[model samples]
Target: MNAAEVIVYEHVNFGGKSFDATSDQPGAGDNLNDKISSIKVKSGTWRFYEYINYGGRYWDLGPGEYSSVESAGIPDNSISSFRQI
Candidate 1:
């Protein structure tokens, strides 16, 4: 069941601006670069990267609410890429 969807937020607790991704993202782009602060794995498992193109430190996350990426061990405003697994 690959109902993979990721909701990324610019602030903690799903606040501020956000975007939804339904497929792998190679990069978050200039607007969102180093701006992500929270995430919600709508479905399926996913791998998040600290740098673009899936490089640098990474973390695997299952479907759930990640109110604070920093508290979850992911540096605040550091996620740059991700993919469903």
Candidate 2:
């Protein structure tokens, strides 16, 4: 039962473990912090951050497939939090 505002994967091409984030990720969970390697927004726009509480490097995205974190110029395992924007 994912709400589906966004979905994140531990690996690229939508592979590996996955989680659903329907709201801001200030506490979406620490396990997912800096561990997102790929992403696919199910709906709405989103902004990813490199530090907790939505701080550090920011990357805005719309509904799309990000094959890998490196492809976006963001280091692998660098994402800390995110939110719809």
Candidate 3:
């Protein structure tokens, strides 16, 4: 899993044969383009995300407030719901 504190910048290929997160080149292998996705902490407790551009060139409203969560083997086109604290 990748961890971040401030902000992480990388080209993510969510539609390729493998979800490769790299900064080498944009659209290296079936990658659409460079998208800006960010993670933010809300209310000093709740962690929310902003500017999640997934699926093509446009962003979609995810399962909940946050687009995705910290996990592994997440399916394509599927976003995880936020768990209340």
Candidate 4:
């Protein structure tokens, strides 16, 4: 297997009540927001594990099963020094 390196300088959480839906809010209408503790990806592929309630059904975000930040409507310019290891 070809090995690569992954590094995350920051942990971002964009869901939950703590995030305002209004213009003042960061990530609105999403749960598990403001729940990021720390980022520690130094090398190798990393995955984010999160439990979410979607349409009243609780589920988990499996590895490689979620969309990217850009696909989620986040601007690319907003993210800095981001690379997939």
TM-score of each: 0.60, 0.59, 0.18, 0.20
Model 3, runs deviating above 4 Å: 1-36, 44-74
Question: What lDDT would each prediction earn against the true structure?
Answer: 0.59, 0.59, 0.27, 0.28
lDDT of 1 by residue, 1-85 (tens): 7555567665545456676766755535434434336676666787766665536767777877756433444343454556765
> Which of candidates 2 and 4 is the stronger one according to lDDT?
2
Clash number by candidate, in order:
0, 0, 0, 2
Kindly give the stretch of ten consecutive residues in candidate 3 with the minimal lDDT sum.
76-85
What order do candidates take by lDDT, descending? 1, 2, 4, 3
Which residue segments of model 1 deviate by more than 4 Å?
A: 1-4, 13-15, 24-27, 31-36, 73-79
What candidate 4 gets wrong by more than 4 Å, as runs, is 1-34, 52-85
Worst 10 residues of 2 by lDDT: 27-36
Question: Residue-wise lDDT of candidate 3 within 36-60, one digit each (tens)?
Answer: 3333222223222222324232222
Please give the lDDT score for candidate 3.
0.27
User: Compared with the true structure, what per-residue lDDT tens digits does model 4 show for residues 8-78?
Assistant: 22235443122112112221223232233233333434323232222222222212423234323232212
